[PDB]
């Protein structure tokens, strides 16, 4: 009935005009960089999530704002790969994580490399913003609901001509002989990663190693054929490392002063849909985000954090897809509470689009808040995301940013 009065709509517009007038750009560099990636979360998925979140909280739906709807800056992102108008998660990851567009099914390599051709990797590797943040002395983290070896998180640390090479068991012998390394091996050896949280236990352990939560199921066991225990090798890199596999272990590790580096692998492969998770054994995406922020924020140089709501497209009955998107929105709100807008650049995007009474390759929305977030505007190529983040953090190739540091 309030909606039948023109005064209600005029007041709602006057409120929106007041937020726009108060909006000022933050002209400093960013100390912290956060990228939230919604897998297959294009414009239609964002709309359906807003409706569902609204309805869950006792509202009609479309009028209720999500945590992302409060981000001041918006842009459209062109997602095409160099060789395909309709892209995949691997090719897009190279663009938003490394700053160069690439070929379909390849990770952290330029479009000079060729899918499934192992020799084409060498001399064609491209380095992520996360890699450059580590080089500048920042702490780095990767948080995902998929396996940590999946295309999107793998974009922060790996270089591969084939996204399906999760472990040595997935690779042809010709590729191994040519010097190619599986994604699980690259996770522990390419660079120092301070925080790794998600799924993918089975790719880290020798063939037959029983899973700690599913010891009676052979399908959940270790798969490696090189007798390597990648978790034990990552733990031995430095003092202060900790490996966790359940929520109870995760919670204690987050408050432990001796823990400076953390690896949490919560399932043999993908983490369960939030709707089906065991609340005592399995941490939510919001819980993993809070733990990563608490651990990464101790570094006075700052941090780079990648957060993926990775099962949104995988679920897309729609109910699974939308409840993952709602949990993804609550992980954004959680990070907004633990960080200050004056020193933290937060970006929200999708890698690619998903393919009544009150078919792929489409552009996706980019949302931004914090220092240099006003550079996120108009219609941009997807690789622009990595460059705005490098520029705001004064990371290579933008050490010459010319930006004033933030306060504190």
CB of 182 to a second copy, least distance (A): 24
CB 301, CB 137: distance < 8 Å: yes
Binding residues for Ca(2+): 213, 266-267, 282
Q: How many residues interact with Mg ion (rule CB under 5 A)? A: 7
**Min dist. Cβ of residue 213 to Mg ion (A):** 5
By C-beta, is 74 or 249 nearer to a second copy? 74
* HSE-up (13 A, CA, CB side) for residue 249: 14
Exactly one of 282, 290, 329, 363 binds Mg ion (CB under 5 A); that residue is 282
Please, which of residues 330-359 interact with a second copy by CB under 8 A? 353, 356-359
Identified catalytic residue from 89, 139, 221, 353: 89
**Nearest-angstrom CA–CA distance, 335 and 324:** 17
CB 274 within 8 A of CB 329: no
Binding-site residue set for Mg(2+) = 39, 152, 308
Residue 21 or 227: which CB sits closer to a second copy? Answer: 21
Query: In this structure, how many other beta carbons lie within 10 angstroms of the beta carbon of residue 273?
Result: 17
Known catalytic membership, residue 89: yes
Give the Å distances, CA to CA, from 3 to 6, 8, 364: 7, 6, 31
Choose one: 39-47, 185-193, 208-216, 254-262; the region binding a second copy (CB under 8 A): 39-47
Residue 310 interacting partner from Mg ion, a second copy, none (CB closer than 5 to 8 Å by kind): Mg ion
211 binds Mg ion per the rule CB under 5 A: no
Q: Does residue 251 touch a second copy according to CB under 8 A? A: no
Indicate whether 54 belongs to the interface with a second copy (CB under 8 A).
no
Q: What, of Mg ion, a second copy, none, does residue 22 touch, CB below 5 to 8 Å by kind?
A: none
Angle, vertex CA 293, rays to CA 287 and CA 299, nearest 5: 155
Q: What are phi and psi of 134, to 5 degrees?
A: -60, -50
- Residue 395 DSSP code: -
**Going by C-beta distance under 8 Å and a sequence separation of 6 or more, which residues neighbour residue 408?**
343
Residue in the block written with tokens 């084939």: 162
- From Mg ion, a second copy, none, interface partner of 89 (C-beta below 5 to 8 A by class): Mg ion
Q: Binder to Mg ion among 39, 194, 211, 363 (CB under 5 A)? A: 39
Q: CA nearest 263: which of 347, 201, 325? A: 201
Task: Tell me which residue of 339, 331, 266, 327 sits closest to 296, measured CA to CA.
Answer: 339
Per CB under 8 A, the list member of 391, 393, 395, 406 interacting with a second copy is 391
- Which residues carry out catalysis? 89
Binding site for Mg ion (CB under 5 A): 39, 89, 152, 266-267, 282, 310
């Amino acid at each position: 009935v309030e909606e039948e009065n023109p005064v209600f709509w005029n007041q709602k517009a006057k409120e929106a005009l007041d937020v726009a007038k108060k909006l000022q750009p933050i002209q400093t560099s960013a100390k912290n960089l956060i990228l939230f990636l919604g897998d297959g979360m294009g414009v239609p998925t964002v709309t359906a999530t807003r409706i569902l979140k609204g309805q869950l909280g006792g509202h009609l739906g479309p009028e209720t704002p999500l945590a992302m709807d409060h981000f001041p800056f918006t842009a459209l992102s062109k997602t095409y790969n160099v060789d395909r108008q309709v892209p995949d998660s691997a090719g897009t990851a190279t663009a938003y994580l490394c700053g160069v567009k690439a070929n379909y099914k390849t990770i952290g390599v330029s479009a000079a490399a060729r899918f499934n051709q192992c020799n084409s990797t060498f001399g064609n590797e491209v380095f992520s913003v996360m890699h450059r943040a580590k080089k500048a002395g920042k702490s780095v983290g990767v948080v995902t609901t998929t396996r940590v070896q999946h295309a999107s998180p793998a974009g922060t640390y790996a270089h591969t001509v084939n996204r399906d090479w999760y472990s040595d068991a997935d690779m042809p012998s010709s590729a191994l002989q040519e010097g190619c390394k599986d994604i699980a091996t690259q996770l522990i050896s390419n660079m120092d990663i301070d925080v790794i949280l998600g799924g993918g236990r089975k790719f880290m352990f020798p063939k037959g190693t029983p899973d700690p939560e599913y010891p009676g199921d052979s399908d959940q066991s270790g798969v490696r054929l090189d007798s390597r225990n990648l978790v034990e090798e990552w733990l031995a890199k430095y003092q202060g490392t900790r490996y966790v596999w359940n929520r109870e272990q995760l919670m204690q590790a987050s408050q432990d002063p001796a823990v400076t580096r953390l690896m949490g692998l919560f399932e043999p492969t993908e983490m369960k849909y939030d709707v089906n998770r065991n609340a005592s054994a399995d941490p939510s995406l919001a819980e993993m985000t809070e733990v990563a922020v608490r651990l990464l924020s101790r570094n006075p140089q700052g941090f780079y954090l990648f957060v993926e709501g990775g099962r949104i497209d995988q679920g897309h009955t729609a109910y699974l897809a939308l409840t993952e998107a709602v949990m993804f929105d609550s992980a954004i709100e959680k990070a907004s509470q633990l960080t200050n807008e004056k020193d933290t650049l937060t970006l929200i995007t999708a890698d690619h689009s998903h393919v009544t009474l009150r078919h792929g390759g489409e552009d996706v929305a980019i949302f931004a808040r914090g220092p240099q977030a006003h550079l996120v505007h108009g219609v941009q190529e997807q690789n622009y995301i990595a460059h705005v983040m490098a520029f705001a953090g004064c990371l290579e190739p933008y050490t010459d940013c010319g930006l004033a540091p933030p306060a504190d």
